[PDB]
Design a protein around this motif. Structure first.
Motif, PDB file in Angstrom:
ATOM      1  N   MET A 336     -26.553 125.948  25.362  1.00 30.99           N
ATOM      2  CA  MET A 336     -27.048 126.601  26.568  1.00 30.99           C
ATOM      3  C   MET A 336     -27.435 128.063  26.344  1.00 30.99           C
ATOM      4  SD  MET A 336     -25.356 126.266  30.433  1.00 30.99           S
ATOM      5  CE  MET A 336     -23.984 127.323  29.981  1.00 30.99           C
ATOM      6  N   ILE A 337     -26.661 128.794  25.545  1.00 30.61           N
ATOM      7  CA  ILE A 337     -26.916 130.228  25.429  1.00 30.61           C
ATOM      8  C   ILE A 337     -27.719 130.665  24.201  1.00 30.61           C
ATOM      9  CG2 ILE A 337     -24.662 130.555  26.590  1.00 30.61           C
ATOM     10  CD1 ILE A 337     -24.200 132.533  24.034  1.00 30.61           C
ATOM     11  N   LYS A 338     -27.584 129.955  23.082  1.00 31.88           N
ATOM     12  CA  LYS A 338     -28.228 130.383  21.839  1.00 31.88           C
ATOM     13  C   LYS A 338     -29.732 130.502  21.962  1.00 31.88           C
ATOM     14  CE  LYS A 338     -26.279 127.541  18.832  1.00 31.88           C
ATOM     15  NZ  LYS A 338     -25.942 126.945  17.490  1.00 31.88           N
ATOM     16  N   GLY A 339     -30.232 131.704  21.722  1.00 32.02           N
ATOM     17  CA  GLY A 339     -31.658 131.948  21.797  1.00 32.02           C
ATOM     18  C   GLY A 339     -32.168 131.983  23.231  1.00 32.02           C
ATOM     19  N   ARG A 340     -31.255 131.937  24.198  1.00 29.35           N
ATOM     20  CA  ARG A 340     -31.628 131.900  25.615  1.00 29.35           C
ATOM     21  C   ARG A 340     -31.003 133.037  26.431  1.00 29.35           C
ATOM     22  NH1 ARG A 340     -30.265 127.491  28.750  1.00 29.35           N
ATOM     23  NH2 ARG A 340     -32.163 127.835  30.008  1.00 29.35           N
ATOM     24  N   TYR A 341     -29.704 133.279  26.235  1.00 25.54           N
ATOM     25  CA  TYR A 341     -28.998 134.327  26.970  1.00 25.54           C
ATOM     26  C   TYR A 341     -28.291 135.337  26.058  1.00 25.54           C
ATOM     27  CZ  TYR A 341     -29.523 131.698  31.378  1.00 25.54           C
ATOM     28  OH  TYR A 341     -30.002 131.052  32.494  1.00 25.54           O
ATOM     29  N   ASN A 342     -28.249 135.069  24.761  1.00 24.15           N
ATOM     30  CA  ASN A 342     -27.602 136.013  23.861  1.00 24.15           C
ATOM     31  C   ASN A 342     -28.591 136.886  23.099  1.00 24.15           C
ATOM     32  OD1 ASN A 342     -28.664 134.315  21.995  1.00 24.15           O
ATOM     33  ND2 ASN A 342     -26.680 133.730  21.062  1.00 24.15           N
TER      34      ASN A 342
ATOM     35  N   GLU B 321     -25.930 131.579  41.759  1.00 18.74           N
ATOM     36  CA  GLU B 321     -25.573 131.608  43.173  1.00 18.74           C
ATOM     37  C   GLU B 321     -24.198 132.234  43.385  1.00 18.74           C
ATOM     38  OE1 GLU B 321     -25.881 127.776  44.938  1.00 18.74           O
ATOM     39  OE2 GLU B 321     -24.554 128.264  46.629  1.00 18.74           O
ATOM     40  N   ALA B 322     -23.239 131.843  42.556  1.00 26.60           N
ATOM     41  CA  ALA B 322     -21.895 132.400  42.622  1.00 26.60           C
ATOM     42  C   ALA B 322     -21.882 133.905  42.355  1.00 26.60           C
ATOM     43  CB  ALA B 322     -20.979 131.682  41.651  1.00 26.60           C
ATOM     44  N   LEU B 323     -22.551 134.333  41.290  1.00 32.52           N
ATOM     45  CA  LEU B 323     -22.573 135.748  40.937  1.00 32.52           C
ATOM     46  C   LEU B 323     -23.374 136.562  41.930  1.00 32.52           C
ATOM     47  CD1 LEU B 323     -22.996 135.508  37.102  1.00 32.52           C
ATOM     48  CD2 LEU B 323     -20.945 136.200  38.392  1.00 32.52           C
ATOM     49  N   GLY B 324     -24.176 135.874  42.738  1.00 29.53           N
ATOM     50  CA  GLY B 324     -25.032 136.528  43.708  1.00 29.53           C
ATOM     51  C   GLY B 324     -26.255 137.198  43.110  1.00 29.53           C
ATOM     52  N   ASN B 325     -26.475 137.001  41.815  1.00 28.07           N
ATOM     53  CA  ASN B 325     -27.610 137.619  41.136  1.00 28.07           C
ATOM     54  C   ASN B 325     -27.937 136.908  39.826  1.00 28.07           C
ATOM     55  OD1 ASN B 325     -29.543 139.402  40.045  1.00 28.07           O
ATOM     56  ND2 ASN B 325     -27.946 140.771  39.250  1.00 28.07           N
ATOM     57  N   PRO B 326     -29.159 136.370  39.705  1.00 24.96           N
ATOM     58  CA  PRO B 326     -29.513 135.589  38.515  1.00 24.96           C
ATOM     59  C   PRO B 326     -29.456 136.423  37.239  1.00 24.96           C
ATOM     60  CG  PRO B 326     -31.460 136.215  39.769  1.00 24.96           C
ATOM     61  CD  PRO B 326     -30.276 136.422  40.662  1.00 24.96           C
ATOM     62  N   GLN B 327     -29.536 137.740  37.375  1.00 25.96           N
ATOM     63  CA  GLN B 327     -29.559 138.622  36.211  1.00 25.96           C
ATOM     64  C   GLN B 327     -28.204 138.699  35.515  1.00 25.96           C
ATOM     65  OE1 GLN B 327     -32.493 141.407  35.715  1.00 25.96           O
ATOM     66  NE2 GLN B 327     -33.613 139.637  36.548  1.00 25.96           N
ATOM     67  N   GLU B 328     -27.138 138.402  36.249  1.00 30.19           N
ATOM     68  CA  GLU B 328     -25.786 138.474  35.691  1.00 30.19           C
ATOM     69  C   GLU B 328     -25.368 137.205  34.951  1.00 30.19           C
ATOM     70  OE1 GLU B 328     -22.736 139.876  38.346  1.00 30.19           O
ATOM     71  OE2 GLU B 328     -24.100 141.258  39.378  1.00 30.19           O
ATOM     72  N   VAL B 329     -26.225 136.190  34.986  1.00 30.09           N
ATOM     73  CA  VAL B 329     -25.912 134.896  34.395  1.00 30.09           C
ATOM     74  C   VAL B 329     -25.642 135.013  32.891  1.00 30.09           C
ATOM     75  CG1 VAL B 329     -26.847 132.607  33.822  1.00 30.09           C
ATOM     76  CG2 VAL B 329     -27.109 133.522  36.144  1.00 30.09           C
ATOM     77  N   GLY B 330     -26.552 135.652  32.165  1.00 28.72           N
ATOM     78  CA  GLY B 330     -26.413 135.784  30.729  1.00 28.72           C
ATOM     79  C   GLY B 330     -25.142 136.495  30.286  1.00 28.72           C
ATOM     80  N   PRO B 331     -24.917 137.716  30.788  1.00 24.48           N
ATOM     81  CA  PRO B 331     -23.677 138.425  30.445  1.00 24.48           C
ATOM     82  C   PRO B 331     -22.413 137.591  30.694  1.00 24.48           C
ATOM     83  CG  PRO B 331     -25.194 139.944  31.449  1.00 24.48           C
ATOM     84  CD  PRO B 331     -25.841 138.571  31.557  1.00 24.48           C
ATOM     85  N   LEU B 332     -22.353 136.873  31.810  1.00 27.06           N
ATOM     86  CA  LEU B 332     -21.152 136.083  32.079  1.00 27.06           C
ATOM     87  C   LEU B 332     -20.999 134.936  31.088  1.00 27.06           C
ATOM     88  CD1 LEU B 332     -19.243 135.396  35.191  1.00 27.06           C
ATOM     89  CD2 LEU B 332     -19.820 133.415  33.789  1.00 27.06           C
ATOM     90  N   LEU B 333     -22.107 134.252  30.783  1.00 26.82           N
ATOM     91  CA  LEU B 333     -22.057 133.136  29.835  1.00 26.82           C
ATOM     92  C   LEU B 333     -21.589 133.606  28.456  1.00 26.82           C
ATOM     93  CD1 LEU B 333     -25.306 131.093  30.703  1.00 26.82           C
ATOM     94  CD2 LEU B 333     -22.925 130.538  31.309  1.00 26.82           C
TER      95      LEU B 333
END
Ligand SMILES: O=C(O)c1ccnc(C(=O)O)c1
Ligand SMILES: O=C(O)c1ccnc(C(=O)O)c1
Ligand SMILES: [Fe+2]
Ligand SMILES: [Fe+2]
Lengths: 342, 342
Positions: A336-342, B321-333
């Motif tokens: 899910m994250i590799k090359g996508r969110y990291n 939706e939980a974080l209330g902001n799509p931009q925070e998705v990556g850092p949390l993951l």
């Protein structure tokens, strides 16, 4: 300067000497600030609790009746129900959850649990001491029905008026349990967090407590939720692996030494590392675990750290269930994250 | 040997020459096997469709009445409703979702959308051709009510008997839409996937279609779900960044060249890269998008690849939706996996 740790050791009343000395404390790689030691009447203490920050209360009389407890008194009055006693060839007593062992077959506990009668526990201790053994024991047993009448008397003497008001003011749920902890000097419970609100009442001996706010999740590297050591830090505080756990280099703690009569509020989700001072003799503690308050009307932003931890926990749980196997959780998260969110 | 790509170019009936030649195909870094070209009566084709694998059907007569369509005929009969027309200073027409632009302010589309009347579209083309321009256009417009009576006649002539039976046999949901695609030679739609079942009916000209099974998610690196380019591959097929996207080195495709009369089944979740042959003139295609079948009784293991993609998509959506902001998705993951699952 502000990282003064547990501060200058307290002097016991009537010139009986310093409660303890620096050399009884283990040596760690991070800095720490002191937890406030306050009076239950101090409005600052009410402030800290309401704000879910730790505070040591010096005069609650929470467990006044138990301050007389030693091994002799307890063996005499505690009944002969079974007591869980953990053994370890090391000073570290890492908590593990046996219900989760089924699905990590490759996990082998360092410490072993054996049920026994109180007198048997007392015997093992005497036995180890007189033979100079290196084995270590830690009794950790919830306080149930099989306790004698004197112990029940003490229990009734507890300051329920004070704590019930705390439970009330904070909207917390029910008292889930009281754990009785009896450990040998030098015993350590490696850093972890609990999903319960905790008043931690010190009874005999001295314990050094190091806490980390929930927002240090990133520096402390909990095991996977499905692992037996869920909620425990993966980092060996005695030999930290900065390659695997780089952010442990940024970790900052709050610490304090508690003694007979002190109660430490350990807010839900706060990491805590607890150790019985070296060469300080046995320790006795009783905790008070309460379910936390319900989740407010609906969500209010910004989220607190502990709410983000909850979200991560739920993600991990639901994925385990969806994939039908907790072992597939990691590979999917990576994909899910590799090359996508990291 | 087995990676023979689109194979030996077909000969058109009556010795009118090879349908196309190798030099009209762009050059890419991965191998490809041919998609089967079969008769609608071939039980092997029914097998592939039932198993959600791609297949080119040579004789469905799905859009027989449309094979006469050229620009002249369409400008004359298609009505004067509005037609979405994308322009780009490059051969690549990366799809973007405008409803998601609001929350990635830093995203600037390569291609621009302009509504226009069919005759205006035809004019722009003629205009560009006669002035040797490098601009490129791609009409992509869903087939709605404002179409003339002749076009509606053709539409009725479609092989609804055949396709309605497919819809039925596969338990698919309703026909969601028919997109009309008219592109200039050399036009490319970069690799992506759709959450619809697709019968892709070729009408004028030749298109090279390269598909990847859903289990190549790991090699193709879709944008975040909340990004405008959700479902599109991040990898530039013309200049692949093997540092950012290491597993693109393992990617293996299925390919084929479709011409007037061919229908390509593109199963839901299958990646597809579609390009109009170089120097092959304009292309015309009409697709048939169907909602997929419902999710069976309850889950059956092992999960298929596409079910895992669905699970990842849902994780990303719920977290936003939980974080209330799509931009925070990556850092949390990241926080969730670093030092824990990687
Ligand atoms: O006093 C203990 O060793 C201990 C360790 C970890 N957790 C708790 C607790 O009361 O949360 C107590
Ligand atoms: O023919 C096209 O360029 C195209 C590109 C991407 N997707 C589709 C589709 O029908 O799914 C069609
Ligand atoms: Fe604990
Ligand atoms: Fe598509």
């Amino acid at each position: 300067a502000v990282a003064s740790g547990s501060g200058e050791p307290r002097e016991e009343a009537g010139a009986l000497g310093p409660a303890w000395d620096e050399s009884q404390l283990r040596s760690y790689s991070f800095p720490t600030r002191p937890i406030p030691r306050l009076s239950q009447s101090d409005p600052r203490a009410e402030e800290l609790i309401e704000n879910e920050e730790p505070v040591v209360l010096t005069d609650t009389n929470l467990v006044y009746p138990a301050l007389k407890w030693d091994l002799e008194y307890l063996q005499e009055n505690i009944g002969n129900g079974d007591f869980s006693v953990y053994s370890a060839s090391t000073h570290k007593f890492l908590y593990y959850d046996e219900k989760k062992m089924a699905n990590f077959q490759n996990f082998k506990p360092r410490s072993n649990r054996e049920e026994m009668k109180f007198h048997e526990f007392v015997e093992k201790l005497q036995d180890i001491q007189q033979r100079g053994g290196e084995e270590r024991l830690y009794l950790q047993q919830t306080l149930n029905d099989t306790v004698g009448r004197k112990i029940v008397m003490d229990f009734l003497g507890f300051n329920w008026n004070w704590i019930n008001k705390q439970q009330g003011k904070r909207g917390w749920g029910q008292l889930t349990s009281n754990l009785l902890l009896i450990g040998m000097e030098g015993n350590v419970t490696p850093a972890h967090y609990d999903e319960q609100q905790n008043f931690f009442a010190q009874i005999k001996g001295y314990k050094r407590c190091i806490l980390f706010p929930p927002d240090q999740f990133e520096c402390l590297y909990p095991y996977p939720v499905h692992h037996p050591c869920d909620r425990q830090s993966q980092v060996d505080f005695d030999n930290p692996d900065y390659e695997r756990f780089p952010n442990f280099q940024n970790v900052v703690g709050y610490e304090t030494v508690v003694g007979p009569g002190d109660v430490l509020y350990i807010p839900m989700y706060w990491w805590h590392h607890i150790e019985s001072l070296l060469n300080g003799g046995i320790t006795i503690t009783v905790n008070f675990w309460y379910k936390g308050a319900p989740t407010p009307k609906r969500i209010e932003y910004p989220l607190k750290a502990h709410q983000k931890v909850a979200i991560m926990r739920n993600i991990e749980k639901m994925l385990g269930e969806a994939l039908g196997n907790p072992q597939e959780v990691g590979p999917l998260l990576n994909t899910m994250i590799k090359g996508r969110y990291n």
